[PDB]
């Protein structure tokens, strides 16, 4: 929920020291206490019902934008733009080529967002970052 951590069930009035921590992979709301509880022993599956993807303790972070899908968008943006660092000077002042490059990178960011064609776009990203 918005206020309470659904795993340890603790509320904010009872425990004011809980903090917003989230998995970058599967994006489930959790507190720092539960992170110190279950993933301190080692990697495990996500304690939510219906989710069992493997996740690591050191990968945990806090959500700045406070909305899950917007965190998904900005983290895919960070994951993509690290190697997609072309500017207008890289295209030697060609505005139209840079605009189509921006359209293509926005399209692949959208595809990694909704996961509709994640496989070929991920393969394209890997082949691009290998260069």
């Amino acid at each position: 929920n918005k206020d309470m951590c659904p795993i340890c069930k603790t509320d904010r009035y009872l425990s004011p020291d809980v903090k917003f921590l989230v998995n970058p992979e599967c994006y489930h709301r959790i507190c720092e206490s539960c992170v110190d509880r279950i993933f301190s022993l080692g990697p495990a599956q996500c304690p939510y019902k219906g989710c069992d993807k493997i996740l690591r303790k050191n990968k945990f972070k806090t959500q700045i934008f406070d909305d899950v899908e917007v965190e998904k968008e900005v983290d895919i943006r960070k994951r993509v733009f690290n190697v997609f660092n072309k500017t207008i000077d890289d295209f030697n002042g060609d505005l139209v080529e840079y605009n189509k490059y921006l359209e293509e990178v926005e399209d692949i960011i959208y595809k990694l967002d909704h996961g509709i064609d994640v496989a070929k776009t991920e393969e394209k990203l890997r082949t691009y970052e290998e260069l």
Partner: peptide, 27 residues
Amino acid sequence: TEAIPGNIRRAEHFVSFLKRLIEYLKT
């Protein structure tokens, strides 16, 4: 007077752009 840079040319891309701008303002 120049053309649209293409980050917001597609409708869904512009929707995501506007939404993350709004969430940045809320932050």
